[PDB]
Design a protein around this ligand. Structure first.
Ligand SMILES: [Cl-]
Length: 167
């Protein structure tokens, strides 16, 4: 299971530049606003899902993007979707509760996790995610995110969640 230092070593090897802000885990709306004020670009949510057929899925989206989980399976070609179990979140993404992040894909050595990217987040620059724990927020450019995914061999499925279409 990878550390933050391991993640940044991976970024460095592959030319993904980063800027990190350390902070207590956010439980207050004022603190969240302060972070967003210091860190431009897309601020994310990252949903760890398991479908009725056993396939794991990670959706990274802007926080405000509405995701209709009742109907999404028709769009992405999955079985009906539920939230995945915490144990698999640890095993495949190496993160603990409340710390889900696209950067956790560095831990998915069996390539069990299919990755869905909100079109609105693909069209954000920069983008911000936790560096494997929610006591920090890490910015990378949009190109950097794509460089990261490419280095892992992860092809994102880009979904327009408003139109409910793969794009
Ligand atoms: Cl870049």
């Amino acid at each position: 299971m990878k550390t933050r230092a391991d993640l940044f070593a991976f970024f460095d090897a592959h030319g993904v530049d980063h800027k990190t802000l350390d902070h207590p885990p956010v439980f207050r709306v004022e603190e969240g606003l302060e972070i967003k004020a210091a860190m431009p670009g897309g601020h994310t949510k990252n949903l760890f899902l398991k479908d009725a057929k056993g396939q794991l899925w990670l959706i990274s989206a802007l926080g405000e993007t509405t995701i209709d989980l009742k109907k999404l399976h028709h769009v992405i070609g999955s079985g009906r979707l539920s939230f995945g179990p915490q144990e698999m979140m640890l095993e495949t993404l190496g993160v603990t509760p409340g710390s889900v992040t696209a950067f956790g894909l560095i831990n998915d050595t069996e390539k069990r996790v299919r990755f869905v990217l909100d079109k609105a987040l693909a069209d954000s620059d920069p983008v911000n995610f936790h560096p494997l724990k929610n006591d920090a927020t890490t910015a990378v450019s949009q190109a950097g995110l794509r460089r990261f995914l490419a280095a892992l061999g992860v092809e994102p499925m880009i979904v327009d969640f408003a139109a409910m279409e793969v794009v």
